Amino acid sequence: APRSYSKTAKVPRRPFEAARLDSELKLVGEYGLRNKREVWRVLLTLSKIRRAARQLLTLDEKDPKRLFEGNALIRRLVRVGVLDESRMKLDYVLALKAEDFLERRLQTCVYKLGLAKSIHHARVLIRQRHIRVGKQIVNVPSFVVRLDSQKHIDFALTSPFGGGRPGRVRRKKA
Amino acid sequence: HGSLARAGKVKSQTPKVEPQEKPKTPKGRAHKREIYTRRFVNV
Amino acid sequence: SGGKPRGLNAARKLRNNRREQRWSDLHYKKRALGTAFKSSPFGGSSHAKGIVLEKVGVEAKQPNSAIRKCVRVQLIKNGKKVTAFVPNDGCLNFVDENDEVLLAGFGRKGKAKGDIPGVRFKVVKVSGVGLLALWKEKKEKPRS
Amino acid sequence: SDSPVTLRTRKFIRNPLLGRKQMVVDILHPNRPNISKDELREKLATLYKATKDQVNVFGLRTQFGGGKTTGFALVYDSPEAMKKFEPHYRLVRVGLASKIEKASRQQRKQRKNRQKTLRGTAKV
RNA sequence: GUCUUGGCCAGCCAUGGUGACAACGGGUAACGGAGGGUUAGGGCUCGACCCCGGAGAAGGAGCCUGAGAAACGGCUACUACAUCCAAGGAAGGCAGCAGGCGCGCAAAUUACCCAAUCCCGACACGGGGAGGUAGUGACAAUAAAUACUGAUACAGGGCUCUUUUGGGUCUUGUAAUUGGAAUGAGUACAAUUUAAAUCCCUUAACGAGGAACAAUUGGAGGGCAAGUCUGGUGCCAGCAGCCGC
Ligand SMILES: [Mg+2]
Ligand SMILES: [Mg+2]
Ligand SMILES: [Mg+2]
Ligand SMILES: [Mg+2]
Ligand SMILES: [Mg+2]
Ligand SMILES: [Mg+2]
Ligand SMILES: [Mg+2]
Ligand SMILES: [Mg+2]
Ligand SMILES: [Mg+2]
């Protein structure tokens, strides 16, 4: 069977716009990202919700299609944490910005919760198996943490921090 | 007046200068860190 | 504007008129007639291989004074003879008589690009080795 | 390891059609790599008051980060039911049945094709 | 005649049937479609190819068995190609799976197994290059390493004062000045996976200080982000999608 697969980013329409290049570099440095692709990734996803939210606003308020689809969109937004309970219904979705979707990343939250003291150290720890969510170890910095899950981040029980067992370097100096 | 016998003229006449060895630049996430530092921080 | 028909039952005239007038479009006419399969030196392919027959020099068009280095290549697939430009400084030495080279398009859609008159193809690989690889210090020409 | 191995059972169902009990087993084994198929079997047997030959497990995939494995466990009512029902590949790996030794697939096919040129008792 | 209707065919009779609303003929580098790409709307283009229908098994024709075939891993004949030979004869159809030649710009192992999906048989039991597994594999797609950090010294932006004793220690950089912890790429007891193996996953004892475990591909006049640097050549060599050097 032909297995479905898709793309998570788009190359910008104009390759060498000075304003666009500078704005992207603001997000890369602030959040300690890797390249421009995962910046384009978040913008593509953010466009998807914004495109979907706008197309429903064109319908009728009483129209059942808008009611079901609109509430479905908000539930993911509220659950993820980019949106609050007081943001009804969809006019506040259009105010979402690329920055807002970026704090919900595990790289940012591990830093905003004081686990790491620099955003570059924060990403390194996650990818290096030193951060777990609940009972689950997560090593993907793009892991989007929900508000419910935001209260269950701590170091891994196998890591020298939290677990206590010395690592390879500390054992070597013995 | 050019000719087929002049091929590779300047290429053969250019002296060979070896590249100066330098400390390696960081790659990936780190490479973006100094670029962001030099552009919007060290101002 | 034009005096196009505006009846409700004039779809036949509108389609027929569009079909006639679409032939004047250069790009549709090229595709519809299938001229790439008929008259192009390639069989509509992106690349083609051939045997180098000789090395020729082409004088650059005004205002430009230089001898562009080229080779006469006879395509293997159909036997047609074309002239291929040899790019980069001193790459004509790598090409020799009776070599097997791969040619590609030279610019945009079979039109000669730059100050090289009448040359519409370029040499990509010689003896199975990339010309850039030979031109740099990356690969070695086959011993043969 | 010093820490105990915790046994769990979900999706338990009694299946007299094959004379067995089907369930999914969960293991909590922190600070140790994993548990072998063998030592897994006695623990199930001692939990269900059965024998080692009463119990068979299919496949243990350890969960990412360690400390947990999941798999499909099969325990039988009678040892005869296991022998009659459990597939031969499962029997050979657990050890109470002999492997059916045979030639290579291509050689058996080549062996068969030569037979087609022979007729009667001359084949054997 | 056919399973049956039918100019399907045989006899007799009549002169009709199609066409400018494109018949007939020709081309297709045309299998049809569900659909792929790209689009505000209207569209353009592709569709050999994981699914449904059709046709074919070197090119035509004919036929037996059989419910079902004009079957080709069935037969018969002709054409082309081709194998063995004692020269009298015999035997053939990879657009099935591997593999080879040729062709080309252009596309993988003469591997393992029916364990999984199903099919077939007298059939719980046997068979299945259907099919699955593994190997080659930068077609395309997802996630994501190549580094983290404390202090010291210096500089900048602040803060009370400008007696300019200014670092005094809020922050950010430079630290060519040092101390640290951590890990996977790799490797391997063991366990796990599997029909049996491999890999992932899990994990003992190993595995990092730049010389290492060292990221490349294009470009720096404009379109279009980036040099008023230095050396060489001197309308030569060469660059340049276009304007141009
Ligand atoms: Mg009308
Ligand atoms: Mg065709
Ligand atoms: Mg074809
Ligand atoms: Mg026949
Ligand atoms: Mg084949
Ligand atoms: Mg440059
Ligand atoms: Mg430019
Ligand atoms: Mg500009
Ligand atoms: Mg000009």
From Swiss-Prot, chain C:
Subcellular location, record wording: Cytoplasm
Main location: cytoplasm
GO cellular component, one term: ribosome
One of the record's GO molecular function terms: structural constituent of ribosome
SUPFAM superfamilies associated with the record: Nucleic acid-binding proteins
PROSITE patterns according to UniProt: RIBOSOMAL_S12
InterPro entries given in the database record: NA-bd_OB-fold (IPR012340), Ribosomal_uS12 (IPR006032), Ribosomal_uS12_euk/arc (IPR005680)
Domain of life: Eukaryota
Function: Component of the ribosome, a large ribonucleoprotein complex responsible for the synthesis of proteins in the cell. The small ribosomal subunit (SSU) binds messenger RNAs (mRNAs) and translates the encoded message by selecting cognate aminoacyl-transfer RNA (tRNA) molecules. The large subunit (LSU) contains the ribosomal catalytic site termed the peptidyl transferase center (PTC), which catalyzes the formation of peptide bonds, thereby polymerizing the amino acids delivered by tRNAs into a polypeptide chain.
Subunit structure, interactors included: Component of the small ribosomal subunit (SSU). Mature N.crassa ribosomes consist of a small (40S) and a large (60S) subunit. The 40S small subunit contains 1 molecule of ribosomal RNA (18S rRNA) and at least 32 different proteins. The large 60S subunit contains 3 rRNA molecules (26S, 5.8S and 5S rRNA) and at least 42 different proteins.
This protein's name: Small ribosomal subunit protein uS12
